[PDB]
Amino acid sequence: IRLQEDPDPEDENLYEKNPDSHGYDKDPIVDLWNMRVVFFFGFSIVLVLGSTFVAYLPDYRMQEWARREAERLVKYREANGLPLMESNCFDPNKIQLP
Amino acid sequence: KTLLHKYSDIPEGTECHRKAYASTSIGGATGLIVSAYSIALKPPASFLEGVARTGRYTFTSAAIGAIFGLTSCISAQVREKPDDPLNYFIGGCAGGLTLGARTRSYGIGAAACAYMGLTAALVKMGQLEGWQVFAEPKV
Amino acid sequence: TMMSGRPGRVPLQFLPNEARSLPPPKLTDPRLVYMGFLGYCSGLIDNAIRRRPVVSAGLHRQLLYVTSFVFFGYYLLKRQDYMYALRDHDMFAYVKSHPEDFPEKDKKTYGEILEEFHPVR
Amino acid sequence: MLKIIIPTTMLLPMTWMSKHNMIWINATVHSLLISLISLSLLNQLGENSLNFSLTFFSDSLSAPLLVLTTWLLPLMLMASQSHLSKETTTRKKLYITMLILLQLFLIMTFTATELILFYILFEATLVPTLIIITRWGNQTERLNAGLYFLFYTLAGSLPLLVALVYIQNTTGSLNFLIIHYWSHPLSNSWSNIFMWLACIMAFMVKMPLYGLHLWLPKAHVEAPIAGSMVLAAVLLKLGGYGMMRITTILNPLTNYMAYPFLMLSMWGMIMTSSICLRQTDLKSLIAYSSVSHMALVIVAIMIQTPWSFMGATALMIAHGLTSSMLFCLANTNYERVHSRTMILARGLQTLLPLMATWWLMASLTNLALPPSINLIGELFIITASFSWSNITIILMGMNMMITALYSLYMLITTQRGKYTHHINNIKASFTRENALMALHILPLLLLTLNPKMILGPLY
Amino acid sequence: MNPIIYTTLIMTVMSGTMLVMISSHWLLIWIGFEMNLLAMIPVLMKNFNPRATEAATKYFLTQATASMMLMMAIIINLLYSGQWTITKMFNPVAMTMMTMALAMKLGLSPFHFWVPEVTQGISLQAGLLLLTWQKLAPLSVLCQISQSINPNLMLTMAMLSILIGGWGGLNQTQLRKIMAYSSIAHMGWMTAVLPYNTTMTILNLLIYITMTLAMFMLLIHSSATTTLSLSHTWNKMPVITSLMMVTLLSMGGLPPLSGFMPKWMIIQEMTKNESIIMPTLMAMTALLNLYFYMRLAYSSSLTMFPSTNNMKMKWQFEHTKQMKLLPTMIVLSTLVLPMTPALSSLN
Amino acid sequence: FYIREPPHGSPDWLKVGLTLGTSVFLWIYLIKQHKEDVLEYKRRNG
Amino acid sequence: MPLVYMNIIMAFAIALAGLLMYRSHLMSSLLCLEGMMLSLFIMSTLIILNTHFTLANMMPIILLVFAACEAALGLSLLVMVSNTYGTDYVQNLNLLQC
Amino acid sequence: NVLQIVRDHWVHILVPVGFVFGCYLDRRSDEKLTAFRNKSLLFKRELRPNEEVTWK
Amino acid sequence: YGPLAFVLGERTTRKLTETSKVITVDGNICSGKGRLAREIAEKLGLRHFPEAGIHYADSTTGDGKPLDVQLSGNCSLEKFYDDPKSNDGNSYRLQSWLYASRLLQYADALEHLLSTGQGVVLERSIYSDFVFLEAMYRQGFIRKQCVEHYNEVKKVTACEYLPPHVVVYVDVPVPEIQSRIQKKGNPHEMKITAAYLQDIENAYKKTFLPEMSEKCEVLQYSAREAEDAEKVVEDIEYLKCDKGPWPDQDDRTFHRLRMLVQNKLEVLNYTTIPVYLPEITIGAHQSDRVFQKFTELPGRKYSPGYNEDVGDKWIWLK
Amino acid sequence: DGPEKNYEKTMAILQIEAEKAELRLKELEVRRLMRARGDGPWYQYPTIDKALIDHSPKTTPDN
């Protein structure tokens, strides 16, 4: 019904031309350098350096700060006989009920 | 607009016969307009054929309106909840079933039930909540 | 509608003399830079349509595109700023002239106001 | 945020002006560097969001998604290299440009501070995804899948645009900070009910909801590998992000209006996990599993509890990674055997051993083997639902069982049994494919050690 | 037609539009419309075909009826007010008649039946003139008389226009008819905001004119009047079809393209006036236009249709004539969204 | 190379000169206008 | 309004209905257009004469001038239609559809 | 062979220059939003000697 | 040329003279028409266009050297001679491509005549190309649908251009033509069947000669008479064809025709009509491959004058 | 950078956005009132100019 080129055979294995293909391209030099770029800049840099960066990220979430403040409050309240946690979040006097 | 005023003036859930008559009048008017447009755009072969098409469209529209009004008002009475949109939904689905019967097709009936009932419920909600299909320019 | 009938509006004037009071748009404005980017894209599309080298051919033509777009954009930005400034001027003047329509409201602190709590249970 | 945005934009001129040999290499390198830059956003002040500017802000919800997108771009390039090799240089550059535009749009969507800008960028993602699917798909059904995807999403979105404009008119601002701080409660009126529906439905469509999920199987099956990766990992998560953001406005009505979507999602998770049991196409099975997990996420969002939100964020990230990896693993087999039928290729463990291990790890994450972030999110969601109703455990446990069954059934059928005798084109797995699978798996396993990063703002 | 005569006729059309847009007297506005019709009729038939003559006849009949109705409305307003100035119209029946006439001139449904036939009959360039320049004068007159307009009638016509323009295009395989129906839909969008904010109508008109100019110039460049003829263009000039795909996406209204801004601002303005159902229905119905736009895009650029052997000869030669404004038109149609706040200049 | 002389052939130095000069004039005019407007703004607003 | 205004507006309505209801010939519909123009002339003249709008007694003449222009256009189109089809029948303007 | 290396591998300068430019523009935007630099009710302090801004 | 030039007063009629004429020398295969055409062009001082071939457009574009068959033509005359009824569809591809080439050549000849005023002599033309198509259809080489496609293309395209003033037919009897083909010795040509040549002659005499004679006069010469080129030129010099289109044509029609002829793509617009005949329809993949190959050809990537590979310079300012 | 930077920048951003929201609502109200009343610069639709009227003595006294 049409003049069309025969379906191309399964794309030639990159191994046949280069047994150590590494994929990534037909040309072996670009294959090697593509593999090196991927491995370096992801595994060596992003995963390892990035994982270290995340692991030692400064605690701006204030978890240690919260713990220290809670310790101070617990010690003070227990020493003074005040209840450990007050039931009212905000002081009742300031609130004007209807 | 007088027909719309007639339908609105009758209190919801009351005087079911008058409400059904108003709905039938509205359906008949809409059917007449549709028949006029159909006759103009798609010409009828004979005057008798044009009359037949007008009668068919007008009766279908009037039956839809009458069933919608009758079912909605009766449901409002029996449930005794006047402002509930579910009554309008039931009326709309009944109208869709009537359309399916007139077209002698189950699929038309079911699709019409769903869409028309939802549209009628939306119209009742617009009545209750004051929704404006056409809004006066106020900016 | 709206500003079309504003009193004192000279017909078919792009920028009234009143606008000169407003600060001129900075030549490094992001909007003007985007207009220049549009000009550059126009030059590239022209080269593509005429099947010339897209990014290297017709540097004079691309320069003309960018310059024309920036030149028109400067005045367009100036007019836009003038129009918005006129809107703000008229709005504030109207608020001042009609104090009753825009009444100052008593400020109640959250302690005084009662807002119902809906538990997420 | 321009530290990330501007380099992503510069990616396009680099790709267009790069040499024909070096397009993939440059794109991958600079995308990886951009991802490295994005890791700075993970440092989030607990109390307040990182308000970089009027336009852009980041929180403990947006940060993980931004990192995920920046990470996904290089994996997408690596995966897409193989099947686009024959394509001309201009077409390859256009494909890369579509991917880069998609990343730029997604980042701006996640960091945008205004709901209208979020809407513009969130809808804008349709164009590059539609172009990718309908121009670089390999089947005649790519066009119909594109039509379904586009129209489902747009029909959902447009009432959202109307609702957002109405909110801008009434409240006076669409900035998320102001909306959160003021956030007057909604009233139970039909108008407010329909506003709630308009706000929710677009994200409900984006996150495949049972009854609105039909687009997802067609699009994922018919799309190219990169498009499937983005759709599964990030594009679905846009719905969750928006729904978590948008829920602030609709406070009280959410309890009344949640029940239809809650029931639909809870039963649909079982239905789709069962569907996966009897699917005959690997990509379709993966897509339906995605649907089930996103149903879990939808339940978490609707319940509107802190633990549910933390689980939703963790599940979003974990599922994005796991589903992308599964799609890539299926794509390798498709390239080798040129069919998506599960039965056709069998016993691949003998032929390709390491890919078998990749499959095993991906399936284990899919079935939520602890201490995977998938399990953390699912467990938190399950506990929140148990608080919502103790009866919820039955459906959720049944879904867990069905998920394990279908994941291990896929693994057994594809990677176990006797090798298909006639198939002779199986060749040793390339370093690229294994590297892609490892890049998928390792971040997911590592994220378990520090799970506060993917646990969201409520943490 | 001698090129001097053609220049004179086109200038006459533009001068009639200018008289409509420059005159404060109703008589002179009607005179401008009449001059526009007189000049336009020969322009539509510049290439002589039976189809061109049929299109010219249909256009003449419709526009003459519209002009007679407009003159009757003017005379009635004069009878009840004694004023010739273009201003509030003091008689409701005259306002209804004038709205009907101006809608018929604009092709707003239920007066749309002529637009696709005329557009198909005439050439692509005459189609561009018909669907971009001719729209200006009736919209200008409507903008000047917006206050008197009954919002219900204009909104009904706009909604019907949107619906019909969307529906008809789905069934069309001819590019010119597709453009005509899309023009109907976009004109329905423009007139929807006329009761509320005229500046939005002006903005939509400008965006629509830019997009329609880009589309018609691209079709002229590709010399395609049918979908199949456009399908071959990928083999000869791929860039043209790619830009056509971008422009079609903008026409559909997809963000981030410039087609989005007019719909966005129209929805905003309608919502400010408490109009919620109408904007929602208008936005949803716009999806059909998107559907046939996407089908055209699939045929043209996204999918590669079969070509013919004789195209190999066409590869060697290059397009002789250059449309200077086409690249700027494409750029404006597709990449102007980041500059919406500038909608206060025409303000 | 081409048997028929290319229509563009060598550069149209008149056209190139006119284009570049128009660009230069537009830029110089824009810069002068910006300076004038800055002066006017400072003058009128002190 | 006196009854003469009623009659003239009725004449315009009748001519409009005639033009909008074609039968076969195009000449008849062009005659209905000319009738509409005549009715408009009569209405305008009556209004301008009753209101002694002196500088508006020229408007009817301009209306007539452009009415004749329109008539000339109509006839020049009818001649081409007749040449291409052999009759002035409207049913032959059927090539363009929708 | 440097002329050759840079002529065909200059594209690798675009994205890092983008990062630099992005940092610059972000600092400019931080300049824009300085209104309450030290006017808060929580971090408001007296500028330590030899200091003009708390960079907030 | 442009509308602005015509407005200024660039008029074709003034340049045209008695010499300004289109002469088409037609005949059967190996009829000697080329020799007479060349002699007529030389004696009457008219530009001679050699008969259009598969690669005429290649001659008129770019370097002018013939391009590869895949890139230009995808058809072989040798294949047609060896395998007239091939399933590839080569016969109708060749016929349609030849009609396209002859249409382009006629457009170029008309452009030369209307720009410079010098007459043009053509070996066969678009008006005579149907002779081969009819012979192919009669012999069964091509299907009826191919003939219908050819008719559609010719109807849409040929009407625009003006027919030639003088038609010269050199008549050689078919058996003598067979002996001539044997003497020439081309292996593929020798395979030509006698019936095919007879049908070529039948088409010429029954249809082409009468239809052409209706518009103007046709000079029919035998082979011996054709050899005396001077007598033919004198016969042409003393022709008076007042009847016919060219006397009718005025400056407006000449402006339209010159505008059409200058734009080659417009000339060839309807040669690519979307009629999906299997013979001339090329699949998407093969089309993409061949178009990419054509683009990679030197001097073809960009518009003429902007291809740096072939030595173009000053592109940045061009 | 220190938390104070983000704290202060958030405060500034909030002030800017709240001012913009209040101004938007005020603009809406102002436009509504001007359109309803016609007593402001906006929505001032044209009226006939009194300069056009001729006040010279007419043909008849009673005018």
DSSP result, J27-39? HHHHHHHHHHH--
R_g of chain D computed on alpha carbons? 21
Tokens in use for D225? 């590998």
The amino acid occupying position I267 is: V
What's the rounded Cα separation, in Å, for the pair D381 and D393? 11
CA distance C61 to C57: 9
Instruction: Report the distance separating Cα E89 and Cα E69, nearest Å.
Output: 15
- Is I238 annotated to bind a ligand? Reply is no
Cβ neighbors of E273 (< 8 A, separation 6 or more) are: B135, B136, B137, B138, B139, E196
* Residue I54, phi then psi, degrees to nearest 5: -60, -30
Task: Report the C-alpha gap between H12 and D94 in whole angstroms.
Answer: 19
Angle between helices J3-37 and D142-171 (to 10 degrees): 80
* Cα–Cα distances in angstroms (integers) from residue D266 to residues D376, D386, G83, I207, in the given order: 19, 13, 74, 81
Chains touching chain F at 3 or more Cβ pairs under 8 angstroms? C, I
Query: D45 and J25 in contact by Cβ < 8 A?
Result: no
Structure's resolution in angstroms: 2.9
DSSP annotation of I207 reads I
> Which residues in F lie closer than 8 A to residue C51 (C-beta atoms)?
none
Q: Is residue G39 part of a domain?
A: yes
Contact yes or no for E149/E87 (Cβ under 8 A): no
Closest CA to D99 of D6, D31, D25, D150: D31
Q: Distance between CA D359 and CA D325 in Å, rounded?
A: 9
Cβ within 8 Å of residue I12, ≥6 positions away: I114, I251, I254, I255, I258
Helix (H) or strand (E) run with residue I49 in it: strand I47-49
Q: Residue F30: its chain C contacts at CB < 8 A?
A: 27, 70-71, 74
Helical segments of C50-100, H only: 59-97
Q: How far apart are CA D113 and CA G66, in angstroms?
A: 60
Segment 37-56 of chain C within 8 Å of chain I by CB:
50-53, 56
Q: Tally the domains of chain G.
A: 1
How far is residue I226's CA from residue I223's CA, in Å, rounded to a whole number?
5
D336 residue type, one letter = R
Contacts (Cβ under 8 Å, ≥6 apart) of H15: D7, D10, D11, D14, D30, D33, D34
How far apart (Å, rounded) are the C-alpha atoms in residues D341 and D327? 14
Residue D339 three-state SS: coil
As a whole number of angstroms, the distance between CA D443 and CA D372 comes to 11
Check whether I28 is labelled as a binding-site residue: yes
| I212 annotated binding-site participant | no
Residue I132 counted as an annotated binding residue: yes
A44-54 as b/e: b if 16+ CB within 10 A: eebbeebbeeb
* Cβ density class B59-71: b for 16+ within 10 Å, e for less: ebbbbbbbbbbbb
CB contact under 8 A, E308 and I61: no
Which DSSP category does I168 fall into? E
3-state secondary structure G39-61: HHHHHHHHHHHHCCCHHHCCHHH
Best of H5, H8, H15, H31 to substitute, by most chain D Cβ atoms within 10 angstroms, is H15
The rounded distance, in Å, linking the Cα atoms of B32 and B35 is 5
- Pairing, β I22-27 against β E307-308: unpaired
- DSSP for residue D50: B
| E250-E253-E258 Cα angle (round to 5) | 50
Contact J45 E272 (CB under 8 A): no
Cβ-in-10-Å burial (0-12, 13-18, 19+) of G28 comes to: middle
- Residue I261 and residue I111 in contact, taking contact as beta carbons nearer than 8 Å: yes
Strand partners, I166: I23
Helices D142-171 and D215-222 cross at an angle (nearest 10°) of 130
Number of Cβ within a 10 Å radius of residue D436: 30
Which residues in chain J are followed by a discontinuity, with C-to-N distance exceeding 2.5 angstroms? none
d(CA J28, CA D172): 10
Farthest CA pair distance, chain C: 72
Cis peptide before E110 (omega within 30 of 0): yes
Evaluate whether B70 touches B101 at the Cβ level (below 8 Å).
no
From D335's Cα to the closest Cα of chain C, the distance in A is: 35
Dihedral sign, CA of C30, C35, C41, C44? negative
Beta strands I281-282; E307-308: pairing state: antiparallel
* Four-point Cα dihedral D3, D4, D9, D12, nearest 10: 120
Please count the other Cβ atoms lying within 10 Å of the Cβ belonging to residue A94. 10
Angle (CA) H45-H51-H53 rounded to 5° is: 65
Q: Give J51→chain D minimum CA distance, Å.
A: 42
I63 touches chain F (CB under 8 A): yes
CB E149 within 8 A of CB E130: no
- What CATH number does residue G62 fall under? 1.10.287.3510
d(CA D444, CA A3): 50
CA–CA distance, C33 with C75 (Å, rounded to integer): 13
CA–CA dist D61, I236 (Å, integer): 91
For chain A, the distance separating the N- and C-terminal CA atoms, rounded to the nearest angstrom, is: 86
- Amino acid at the residue B53: R
D342: which 2 tokens?
């599960």
Q: What tokens were used for E68?
A: 């007679």
Q: What are phi and psi of E44, to 5 degrees?
A: -60, -30
Residue from the list E87, E147, E272 with its beta carbon closest to the beta carbon of J28: E272
Specify if G98 maps to a domain. Answer: no
* Residue from C1, C13, C72 to probe the interface with E (highest E Cβ count within 10 Å): C1
Distance CA E184, CA D386 (A): 55
Buried b / exposed e over D198-221, threshold 16 CB at 10 Å, is: bbbbbbbbbbbbbebbebbbbbbb
DSSP A5: P
Residue from I294, E222, I318, I316 nearest F6 by CA: I318
Q: For the beta carbon of residue C28, count every other beta carbon within 10 angstroms.
A: 7
Task: Give D374: exposed, middle or buried? Use CB within 10 Å, 0-12, 13-18, 19+.
Answer: buried
Distance CA E38, CA F46 (A): 58
Distance CA G44, CA G52 (A): 12
Strand partners, E174: E226
Instruction: Please give the Cα distance from E122 to D101 (Å, whole number).
Output: 40
Burial of F5 (0-12, 13-18, 19+ CB in 10 A): exposed
> Which DSSP helix (H) or strand (E) runs through E22?
helix E3-22
Question: How far apart, in whole angstroms, are the C-alpha atoms of residue E333 and residue C32?
Answer: 18
For residue I181, what are the CA distances in angstroms to E174, I95, I136? 51, 21, 19
Distance CA E67, CA G74 (A): 14
Q: Find chain A residues with C-beta within 8 A of D338's C-beta.
A: 10
| Number of inter-chain CB pairs under 8 A, C vs J | 39
Distance in angstroms (rounded) separating the CA atoms of residues B64 and B116: 10
Q: Is E80 exposed, middle or buried (0-12, 13-18, 19+ CB in 10 A)?
A: middle
Q: Which residue has the tokens 């309106």?
A: B65
CB contact under 8 A, D146 and E294: yes
- Do the Cβ atoms of C24 and F29 come within 8 Å? no
| Cβ-based neighbour number of residue D141 at 10 Å | 13
CA atoms of E73 and D286, how far apart (whole Å): 67
CA I129, CA I271: separation in Å to the nearest integer?
14
Structure token digits, residue I189: 């040509």
Tokens standing for C83?
């129009």
Distance CA C102, CA C96 (A): 8
Question: Are the C-beta atoms of D202 and D160 separated by less than 8 Å?
Answer: yes
Q: Are E236 and I274 in contact (CB under 8 A)?
A: no
Do the beta carbons of residue C87 and residue J27 sit within 8 Å? yes
Residue D272 to residue I306: CA distance in whole angstroms: 59
Residue whose structure tokens are 């198509």: I133
Is the bond into E256 cis (omega within 30 degrees of 0)?
Answer: yes
Using an 8 Å Cβ cutoff, are C60 and F20 in contact?
Answer: yes
Task: For residue I112, report the phi and psi dihedrals to the nearest 5 degrees.
Answer: -65, -45
Which are the contacts of A75, defined by CB distance < 8 A and separation ≥ 6? none
Contact criterion met (CB below 8 Å) for G70 and E37: yes
Radius of gyration of chain G (CA): 17
Q: Are strands I218-222 and I281-282 parallel, antiparallel or unpaired?
A: unpaired
- Check if the beta carbon of residue D17 is closer than 8 Å to that of residue D76: no
Query: DSSP string of A67-88?
Result: HHHHHHHHHHHHHHT--SS-S-
Report the phi/psi class of residue A97: left, alpha or beta, with left for phi > 0 and alpha for psi in -120 to 50: beta
Give Cα D65 to chain centroid, integer Å: 9
- The residue ranges of every structural domain in chain C are 1-98
Helix/strand/coil (H, E, C) string of E140-173?
HHHHHCCCCCCHHHHHHHHHHHHHHHHHHHHCCC
Chain H positions touching D10 (Cβ under 8 A) are 14-15, 17-18
CA D305/CA D284 separation, integer angstroms: 32
Within-domain flag for G97: no
Interface test with F, best of C51, C67, C74, C82 (most F CBs within 10 A): C67
Domain range for G23 is 3-92
How far apart, in whole angstroms, are the C-alpha atoms of residue D202 and residue D243? 9
Find out whether I43 is annotated in a ligand binding site. no
First vs last C-alpha separation in chain D: 23
Q: Residue C58 and residue C54: Cα distance in Å, rounded? A: 9
